[PDB]
Design a protein around this nucleic acid. Structure first.
Lengths: 164, 164, 149
RNA sequence: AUAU
RNA sequence: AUAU
């Protein structure tokens, strides 16, 4: 039997949003890029936001990392990123990366399910780095790297600080 | 209906002792305090006592923490303490302490329920410090700081070191 | 009798080469993880029993000692603290570490502790090969192929 | 073997 | 995600 199918076309914002894990919550930050000459791989350090910085909030567990890449309207060359482990020549990140966000493709993203699981939010901040590459020269703000990280939902959100 | 009540007086030792958590035990150590002039906040590094120093032992997780303050009979000014995250200006500890041991009040202790939870015993020793303030000059020996820490009853000291 | 590993735990064995040093010097060797255990995720694996060998060359004569103990300030002190030391003067040239590193992460093994080597006589690089075997929870990942997109 |  |  041959089922005739019709492919209804989707508009941009219509992708399935991925819900987080029961008892986890996604938080997202942005990292503005550095300036660099063409074909230079730059490193960007993952900086934790603030809420996720107290000693209790730091020990949180991670468990799905999504890499976005919001380059601006006038950029031209190919741009790439990957969140890998701190590499010793930067470019090599791209040779091990389990996923690379390339603007050359339809979706400029990278997802890391089963890759950085069970890591401490602080651990994420320490043994991994974000790498950026572009075949053109970048200026202080062309590529804004979005990092979205799932982690156990915190306990402080639940109470007031006692008094006394 | 109005309930008549009599408030029978408690002497000193008569306070309730707080029991630990099933699967936990409390270790206590003393930290003698160095000398300093009046109105100066000093820093005291939390040093791990020996049982809790081997690597297996170093990773027990922390539960609730209690801070005592045993100052000797000839002291006079106000004395204050707290265990906060290693502050950049010793005196700011007091602006962020969720509990302060002021000797101006009846009980000279500070407890830390729901704060510091889940941290590693080594982490305690690393990213936190004790601060002591007094309105008068101190000499090495007054104000022995007592620190009592809850942690997973160690699996370790349930066996001898092997032979051959 | 060969010691079986634990259910779940598999044993990883790897070597490290001698450093070429002078007589009576306690040198230090850094434990570095073998590539298979090198991913961010594999590093989080928990350690179990750890064993230490000593595969010295047939002509090396003198006493050779080794122990795997927490990173030291004064290398030689390792021996005064080592829960087990490997000698060649003894019938057995091993150091078994039961209950001593039980809850550690492979990552911590590579950071928190080091390997030390003493020899009464001076050594050439490669005179003594060090074998270190670590029980670690079997990595889940070995059962999947890396995705392709 | 055990533990959370 | 797994899986306990």
């Amino acid at each position: 039997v041959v089922q005739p199918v019709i492919v209804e076309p989707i508009a941009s914002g219509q992708g399935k949003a991925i819900k987080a894990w029961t008892g986890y919550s996604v938080s997202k930050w942005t990292a503005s890029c550095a300036a660099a000459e063409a074909k230079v791989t730059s490193a960007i350090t993952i900086s934790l936001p603030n809420e996720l910085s107290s000693e209790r909030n730091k020990q949180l567990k991670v468990g799905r990392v999504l890499l976005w890449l919001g380059l601006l309207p006038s950029v031209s060359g190919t741009v790439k990123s990957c969140v890998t482990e701190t590499q010793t020549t930067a470019a090599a990140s791209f040779q091990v990366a389990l996923a690379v966000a390339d603007n050359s493709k339809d979706v400029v993203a990278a997802m890391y399910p089963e890759a950085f699981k069970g890591i401490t939010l602080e651990q994420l901040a320490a043994d991994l780095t974000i790498y950026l590459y572009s075949s053109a020269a970048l200026t202080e703000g062309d590529v804004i790297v979005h990092l979205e990280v799932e982690h156990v939902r915190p306990t402080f959100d639940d109470s007031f600080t006692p008094v006394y």
